[PDB]
Design a protein around this ligand. Structure first.
Ligand SMILES: *[C@@H]1O[C@H](CO)[C@@H](O[C@@H]2O[C@H](CO)[C@@H](O[C@@H]3O[C@H](CO[C@H]4O[C@H](CO[C@H]5O[C@H](CO)[C@@H](O)[C@H](O)[C@@H]5O[C@H]5O[C@H](CO)[C@@H](O)[C@H](O)[C@@H]5O)[C@@H](O)[C@H](O[C@H]5O[C@H](CO)[C@@H](O)[C@H](O)[C@@H]5O)[C@@H]4O)[C@@H](O)[C@H](O[C@H]4O[C@H](CO)[C@@H](O)[C@H](O)[C@@H]4O[C@@H]4O[C@H](CO)[C@@H](O)[C@H](O)[C@@H]4O[C@@H]4O[C@H](CO)[C@@H](O)[C@H](O)[C@@H]4O)[C@@H]3O)[C@H](O)[C@H]2NC(C)=O)[C@H](O)[C@H]1NC(C)=O
Ligand SMILES: *[C@@H]1O[C@H](CO)[C@@H](O[C@@H]2O[C@H](CO)[C@@H](O[C@@H]3O[C@H](CO[C@H]4O[C@H](CO)[C@@H](O)[C@H](O[C@H]5O[C@H](CO)[C@@H](O)[C@H](O)[C@@H]5O)[C@@H]4O)[C@@H](O)[C@H](O[C@H]4O[C@H](CO)[C@@H](O)[C@H](O)[C@@H]4O)[C@@H]3O)[C@H](O)[C@H]2NC(C)=O)[C@H](O)[C@H]1NC(C)=O
Ligand SMILES: *[C@@H]1O[C@H](CO)[C@@H](O[C@@H]2O[C@H](CO)[C@@H](O)[C@H](O)[C@H]2NC(C)=O)[C@H](O)[C@H]1NC(C)=O
Ligand SMILES: *[C@@H]1O[C@H](CO)[C@@H](O[C@@H]2O[C@H](CO)[C@@H](O)[C@H](O)[C@H]2NC(C)=O)[C@H](O)[C@H]1NC(C)=O
Lengths: 338, 123, 334, 333, 338, 333
């Protein structure tokens, strides 16, 4: 009874309908309302300078060609009718290979109201580029953008707007954080215009602010290097006749520092400049190098000026830990504040 | 240690149901094939039925449609429902577990064996 | 309104299996390219990644119309309904178009019959890199495209006024290399099925040296200089000078290790492997010098005293000569 | 008899509208769900997800597909699924999933005279679940799978588990090389989104990690190196090169162990139990080498006091290490 | 006119034909004869407990609706036509992710005889599950199964049979073996019944029996451990006064054993129990540990009871090689004969 | 002009049966094939495969497509390939392949007035070849590519190379970083399967691995460590710590090198030339340390015998090692 009337409505809307033409073609500028719900802010890949996000993308617009009359003021359809109408050709400017989920059905929904207003929702997994300045690594902060707009329609044809106030137009779930090594501080929502060789286009922008967590590098990298420096300074308390013991101490601490430096630099993306961890390792290397030079000097003045050699060892037992402590205090006070 | 203890058996009057069970202990046989064998007095040991991890049921060409095998994976056990018993079914029924290397229908491919259970059919 | 009538009449009597002017003259195509970003260069696989907007313009007499509308701006829904050139990239290992949330294609038609077709592409293209002069190497990575089926007698390509455009060159993903400039050419390539017009774009890339200079060359120079400092201490034959020699050997070994990680596993010798190996030879020979001097200490006045004076003179000279040949060859000769 | 079936089926599909749900505009359509788990594998700590293979069945009644005159249930070719209405079910935490298609698409459609439709699929899905690894490897995990309708609301569609707690089978036959499934649970609830309410079903498993691999591969080498570092205390204090080499080479071996564990384990930037055990062993061997530093520093002026320190160290180090083990294992087992 | 006659027969066969119904629906059970040709038995992955196989899958059944009369008696058909008729919905029960090749065209073939028989062949690559018991690793043997059947049709509607004797119904090519680490001994072919929540189904099964090659583990694990144990017992022949030599010797053979033990587990999958290699390594580790304890005892008793220290060293020079040779004899007789 | 061509093309495709091969029921259709190789890369020893990119062309005659009145070779849009009969060619040893599709599907269809059809495809494929590595890294491999019809026999289709020995081009423009292509070869034979005889064309290459990388990377470190192990023969036998440390560190370094290269290269559990050379160097340094163990054992009672043993080791070891290297570099080169 009712289904026949609903299908006759559905079989009447697309009579003389062209989905190749936008609503209000030649009479007005099509307006699109957009909002995003982030189900899970996925992983961030430092090696590829990109990140993943799983979202619900909702678009609203008015099409006067689809007005209908009937008891059901709202009609919700899955995908066959939604593929027979006009939809905005939104694309992400900085988006890389993205996925539209198809399990167990196309994750697309089209709702129509009596006045002809359409609502289009889809579930997407967007992978986008996030340029990074890793000079302060691993104490860096980043703002990853997400920019989208219309590929084929200039700003004189299609314009985008947020459904609500821009802050309230992007919503993130409380459990929707999947960041092992980052903290999501917040987001900024913006709109603007881009100019190309084919015309001017409206672009909608979102920025997510991230701050990297450092405890992993502290326990995995910084502490072993500090401990290796302490081991290298342990040699100053051994008697000067123990040439093999102090030589083995020196060469094993050099090999340990080399191993730590290689491991630390084998995880960063290959960027042709030094980071804060590179400077920390370089200073630890120069401290163990100067400790081995100090032993070369002590062994040099032995049997000729034993008093000078003893004085060098006594003063190095004070100077080396003090200089390393001052270096650490300067390093951490400089970088944690900034 | 690993023991396959068998229950059930006894005597039946040339018919009726007879559910012979087999409980395992000392090792979980979830990833193994659990089977049942039959040994008539002095003749030979004969394959009867088997069930693997995927619940695929194998039967001998003589007992197909009469004996039903099953496994209780939670309790790590296996049962065999004997229906339409005949005097020729009087033998010692064995319970076995193995990986089925070189054939699940051959008795020489099962690591663990039960102590047996006499089933007597009277007509 | 009447736009649907225009589209219906245009598509009426249209055969998209036939190129425009199939039996009259070759179809002339004007191409444009906007480079969004040039991604990382993979020396191990000898490939690079590029993301572009690709635009093509041509004339189709079958698509003329008369109305007050000057241009019909359309999405990809009509791309499959008209004739499109079968342009492909000859040196591409793997390329794909973007489909989120809709196919990233645009089509515009003018009343005179001119068609503009644009789409967004991400391409992994082949670039064979010669790393003989690493880290002083320069490369020109090409990107070539042509028509798969239509020879030069049927389809001809041509660059427009602004051929290749680049936006924010500082936002690209090149860490190892720096972008210099680009060129675009045209050539005719003879194949087994005919002669085809091939359009190429070359991107020139030069590697930056500040990292490899501050990480390898300077530390190695300072260790070599300290080991020649060691040559006027050797006459003592002391444990300290022996420890100094072996510790400089250890420092050079550590630098050699960090020397052989900044490069791909090429099986030819690079300039960095030569520099590190020569530094290793210099410290090795300084230790053989000490082994000879130590044995020579009793026999020293007859010959080892002048032997050590000569080594004290010859070694800095030979190292300056080596550095002169190395930098002359790699900066002015290769 | 086959021509009559062909006529009846073509009659049913004639005029059928795929864009309208059963009882469209009226009472909601009730959908029952069954899951037959076939295998669970590849529980990845680095990727923070797990792979699941299952048979997913859906049961619902559509009056437009009711037929009479044939006393049979009609299992049709799965391509007829493209000619019917099926629910828009999806998994909320699915990262990547597909339907098997060898030798054909692993799909089933079955019809009943009263109009009930059975719709089956064979699905392999990778589902994301957060893991709290502060107690790793002595940790328990709770990974779920969420089933929801993408477009309809509770005024249109409803979800329930078909069979109660028996709706999911096959968990008891699963064997995981590293984990052991402790329990599974079925939850039915609705989710109030911005577009309205949404029916949801949830299936969760609780996993308890096995320890034998870490016992034989991780903890035993560190324990043995710690015990071997006590061999120095039974060596004479004038053997400076031997005791220094033993202490610093055991330190280097412990560092190599920790570094390679850092290379293989997932990057989890917070303190786990394994890091506490490795750091405690590193502290014990660090203090053993600092003890020999003191002994070497004083064995010439006071050789008797250095011998008494070595003798007392022969007792203090094993006792404090067993006290550390006792405290570590009590707090984590 | 032969082509037009054939075209007429083709355009006549499918008149009144519904491909949504199996042959004999409501009248009889559809009988499917199946045979398999293995072109390559691909790599076996111990980490994932899976294997790859490339096969020609041949199915044969009778369809009375497709009888014809013509000059020929066998018809070879394009793959577009093979998709117009009803075919079985065969799937592999233990498959993980399989690929049907369609390069450069779909690798399918459908032949029709005059009496109505249909032969349907296809080329497939199957990645299947082979659960393994690794208690005897690396001296273990496995049976990798391959199960297939109908996904939708119960045994009251569709049954499967082998075309020939079950032994001769699965044939492997001479160059089929692509196994670096296994030796394919043979296969056994069977057929059973499974029960699901939807009904009872017929399952056709094949088991491939594999035995692992051990030379790789001999060159990677056993020989270095034996050489390390021999070196540690070589330490007994150095003079007692060479304290640093024997201490470095013992501690470096212990660190070498630790390195080998950690190295070996990477090949092994993450299993709960202990393999045969775990026991071999643990015994070698206990031997070098006891050799260093022996030296600690000799050094402790030196300079106070030299007679006892000499007696301990003389007995250790005999006891250690004897006990290790006996352990090796037991180990290599318990496992090599299984 | 244009309308005449459109009329002719619509006439050709009207009443065309795509399910029927040319000359169906009569003589077999002859298919000529050409290949133009663009690149070869990723010759993987671990996966035992290689990657190939090529332009594959086929040439046959179909009298149903003959046309008159147009003195032109009609190159059509590649979507017309979906409306025409094409051979069911496939590659037997292919593991994974695809046709490029940017900016469109890389496919070509060209017609000729006599009815001849030219069909081109741009294909990237991964082909598997068996590798015999008993002479690694001094090995020579033979990797092929098989071309066959999946469903036609010699009664209906035949294969041949179009152009004789010129059918395959582009081999001389292939630059492998590790191999050099010594030769390539073309074969044509009929494979006798169960269903009947099948035509087959085979193209094979012979690759010879470059050796300069391995001389520097593998053999030289082993040679230099073996020479360094001889330094102890010139050291006084009362310096036990130095000769023991040198011997055991050369033994540990040789074991580390051998096991790392074994773990890095694909697992081929049999004896290769690299293993024979590394074992020979491990034996030489093992006997050098056993020689010092004998000298240290006998140096107290018989110092003169110990010094004579050291002098003879200083002579015998370099000579025996050079004889071992001569045998090695003759039995394989
Ligand atoms: C061996 O076997 C394999 C399979 O195992 C096979 O691969 C498959 O090959 C087929 C072709 O034979 C492919 O199908 C085509 O795909 C084209 C696009 O390819 C991209 O997208 C694929 C996914 O498609 C979805 O999304 C697109 C939009 O992005 C949409 O158009 C599709 O319909 C489809 O959408 C469905 O799914 C989404 C969810 O995902 C739902 O939301 C939606 O509702 C719908 O259900 C994707 O798979 C592709 O990736 C593959 O390929 C790339 C290389 O290209 C590779 O890198 C990847 O790794 C991967 O392999 C790729 O991203 C699509 O355009 C084609 O559709 C054409 O043609 C069909 C058939 O004629 C027609 O029905 C369509 O309508 C459409 O006609 C055109 O389309 C034009 C597009 O611009 C349009 O301008 C025209 O107007 C016209 O459109 C219509 O026009 C009329 C008239 O005006 C109008 O009335 C209509 O409204 C409409 O506008 C076609 O679907 C398939 O994708 C391949 N799959 C894979 C996995 O490779 C391989 O080819 C075989 N080899 C051999 C040798 O046999
Ligand atoms: C892994 O981790 C997940 C997440 O924590 C676990 O999933 C949780 O499991 C528990 C136990 O099954 C769930 O609690 C149950 O929830 C159901 C559903 O309640 C909903 O529907 C009701 C109508 O059917 C409705 O009344 C509820 O609303 C009331 O309750 C909520 C509670 O927050 C409250 O906010 C509302 O205001 C209402 O008061 C709600 O919409 C519920 O039916 C269960 O009740 C059981 O217990 C009560 C006594 O406590 C008893 O009276 C009932 O008869 C019944 O026996 C129960 O509360 C929880 O909802 C799940 N979480 C999520 C997010 O789904 C999962 O179990 C973990 N895995 C493992 C293996 O443990
Ligand atoms: C890319 O191609 C264009 C088109 O051929 C080149 O532009 C031409 O430059 C020459 C001078 O070198 C002028 O005489 C032509 O009039 C230009 N043609 C135009 C603008 O359409 C352009 O130089 C090329 N880019 C290079 C070589 O880097
Ligand atoms: C159309 O294609 C045919 C076939 O390739 C061309 O005929 C060839 O012409 C060359 C040059 O005269 C001859 O050397 C070949 O022997 C011809 N082929 C055959 C099979 O006879 C023909 O020239 C092409 N026509 C055009 C206009 O390009």
């Amino acid at each position: 009874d009712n289904t026949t009337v609903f299908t006759r409505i559905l079989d009447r809307l697309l009579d003389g309908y062209d989905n190749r033409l936008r609503p209000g073609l030649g009479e007005r500028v099509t307006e699109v309302k957009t909002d995003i719900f982030v189900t899970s802010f996925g992983p961030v890949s430092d090696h590829d300078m990109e990140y993943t996000i799983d979202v619900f993308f909702r678009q609203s617009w008015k099409d006067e060609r689809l007005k209908f009359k009937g008891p059901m003021t709202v009609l919700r359809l899955n995908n066959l009718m939604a593929s027979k109408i006009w939809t905005p050709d939104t694309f992400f400017h900085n988006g890389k290979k993205s996925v539209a989920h198809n399990m167990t059905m196309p994750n697309k929904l089209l709702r129509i109201t009596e006045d002809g207003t359409l609502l289009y929702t889809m579930r997407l997994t967007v992978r986008a580029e996030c340029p990074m300045h890793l000079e302060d690594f691993p104490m860096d902060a980043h703002a990853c953008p997400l920019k989208f707009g219309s590929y084929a329609y200039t700003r004189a044809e299609v314009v985008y707007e947020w459904t609500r106030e821009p802050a309230r137009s992007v919503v993130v779930a409380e459990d929707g954080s999947r960041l092992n090594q980052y903290d999501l501080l917040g987001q900024t929502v913006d709109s603007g215009i881009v100019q190309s060789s084919t015309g001017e286009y409206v672009v909608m922008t979102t920025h997510f602010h991230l701050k990297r967590k450092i405890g992993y590098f502290v326990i995995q990298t910084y502490l072993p290097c500090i401990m290796t420096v302490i081991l290298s300074q342990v040699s100053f308390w051994l008697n000067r006749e123990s040439v093999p013991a102090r030589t083995v101490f020196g060469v094993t601490t050099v090999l340990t520092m080399t191993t730590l430096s290689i491991s630390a630099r084998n995880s960063l993306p290959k960027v042709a400049y030094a980071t804060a961890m590179d400077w920390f390792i370089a200073v630890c290397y120069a401290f163990v190098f100067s400790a081995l030079i100090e032993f070369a000097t002590v062994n040099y003045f032995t049997k000729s000026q034993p008093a000078r050699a003893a004085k060098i060892d006594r003063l190095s037992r004070i100077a080396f830990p003090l200089l390393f402590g001052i270096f650490n205090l300067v390093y951490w006070a400089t970088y944690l504040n900034r | 240690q690993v023991q396959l203890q068998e229950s059930g058996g006894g005597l039946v009057q040339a018919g009726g149901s007879l559910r012979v069970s087999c409980a395992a202990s000392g090792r979980t046989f979830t990833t193994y094939i659990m089977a049942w064998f039959r040994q008539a007095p002095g003749k030979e040991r004969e394959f009867l039925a088997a069930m693997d991890q995927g619940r695929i049921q194998y039967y001998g060409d003589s007992v197909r449609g009469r004996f039903t095998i099953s496994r209780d994976y939670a309790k790590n056990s296996v049962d065999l429902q004997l229906d339409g018993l005949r005097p020729e079914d009087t033998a010692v029924y064995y319970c076995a577990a193995g990986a089925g290397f070189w054939g699940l229908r051959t008795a020489s491919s099962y690591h663990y064996w039960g102590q047996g259970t006499q089933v007597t059919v009277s007509s | 309104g009447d736009v649907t009538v225009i589209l219906n009449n245009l598509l009426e009597g249209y055969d998209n299996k036939l190129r425009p002017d199939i039996g009259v003259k070759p179809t002339l195509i004007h191409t444009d390219m906007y480079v969004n970003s040039i991604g990382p260069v993979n020396a191990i696989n000898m490939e690079y990644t590029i993301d572009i907007f690709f635009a093509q313009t041509w004339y189709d007499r079958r698509l003329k119309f008369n109305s007050t509308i000057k241009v019909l701006r359309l999405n990809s829904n009509m791309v499959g309904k008209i004739w499109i050139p079968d342009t492909f990239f000859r040196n591409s290992k793997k390329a794909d178009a973007h489909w989120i949330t809709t196919p990233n294609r645009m089509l515009r038609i003018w009343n005179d019959g001119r068609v503009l077709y644009t789409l967004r592409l991400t391409i992994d293209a082949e670039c064979q890199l010669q790393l003989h002069n690493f880290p002083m190497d320069e490369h020109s990575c090409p990107l070539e495209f042509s028509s798969y089926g239509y020879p030069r007698e049927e389809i001809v390509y041509q660059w427009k006024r602004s051929s290749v455009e680049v936006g924010d060159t500082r936002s690209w993903r090149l860490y190892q290399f720096s972008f210099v400039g680009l060129r675009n050419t045209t050539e005719v390539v003879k194949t087994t099925s005919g002669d085809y017009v091939v359009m190429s774009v070359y991107f020139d890339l030069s590697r930056r040296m500040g990292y490899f200079t501050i990480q390898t060359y300077i530390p190695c120079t300072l260790i070599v200089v300290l080991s020649w400092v060691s040559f006027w201490i050797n006459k003592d034959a002391v444990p300290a000078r022996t420890s100094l020699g072996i510790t400089t050997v250890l420092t050079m070994t550590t630098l050699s290790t960090i020397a052989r990680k900044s490069l791909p596993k090429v099986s030819y010798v690079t300039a960095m492997d030569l520099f590190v190996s020569v530094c290793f030879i210099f410290v090795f020979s300084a230790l053989v010098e000490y082994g000879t001097l130590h044995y020579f200490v009793s026999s020293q006045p007859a010959r080892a005293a002048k032997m050590d004076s000569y080594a004290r003179i010859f070694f800095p000279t030979a190292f300056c000569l080596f550095n002169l040949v190395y930098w002359v060859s790699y900066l002015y000769l290769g | 008899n086959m021509s009559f079936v062909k006529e009846t089926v073509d009659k049913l599909l004639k005029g059928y509208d795929i864009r309208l749900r059963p009882d469209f505009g009226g009472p909601p359509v009730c959908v029952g769900m069954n899951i037959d788990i076939a295998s669970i594998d590849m529980v990845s700590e680095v990727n923070m997800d797990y792979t699941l293979t299952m048979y997913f069945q859906q049961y619902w009644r559509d009056k437009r597909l009711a037929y009479s005159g044939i006393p049979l249930n009609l299992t049709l070719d799965n391509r007829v699924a493209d000619q019917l209405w099926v629910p828009d079910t999806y998994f909320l935490n699915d990262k990547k999933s597909f339907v098997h298609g060898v030798t054909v698409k692993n799909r089933m459609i079955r019809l009943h005279p009263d109009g009930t439709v059975l719709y089956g699929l064979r699905i392999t899905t990778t589902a994301a679940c957060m893991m709290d690894l502060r107690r790793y490897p002595l940790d328990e995990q709770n990974c779920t799978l969420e089933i929801e309708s993408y477009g309809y609301t509770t005024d249109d569609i409803e979800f329930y588990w078909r069979g109660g707690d028996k709706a999911v089978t096959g968990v008891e036959r699963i064997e995981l090389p590293q984990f052991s499934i402790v329990e599974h649970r079925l939850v039915s609830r609705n989710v109030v989104f911005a577009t309205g309410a949404y029916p949801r079903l949830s299936l969760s498993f609780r996993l308890k990690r096995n320890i034998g691999y870490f016992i034989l591969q991780t903890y035993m080498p560190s324990i043995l190196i710690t015990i071997l570092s006590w061999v120095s205390f039974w060596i004479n204090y004038d053997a400076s090169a031997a005791r220094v080499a033993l202490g610093i080479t055991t330190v280097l071996t412990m560092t190599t162990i920790n570094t390679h564990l850092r290379e293989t384990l997932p990057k989890i930037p917070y303190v786990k139990a394994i890091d506490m055990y490795l750091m405690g062993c590193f502290v014990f061997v660090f203090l053993a080498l600092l003890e020999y530093a003191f002994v070497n520093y004083i064995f010439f002026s006071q050789p008797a006091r250095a011998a008494a320190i070595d003798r007392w160290s022969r007792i203090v180090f094993p006792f404090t290490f067993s006290l550390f083990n006792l405290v570590y294992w009590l707090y984590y087992v």
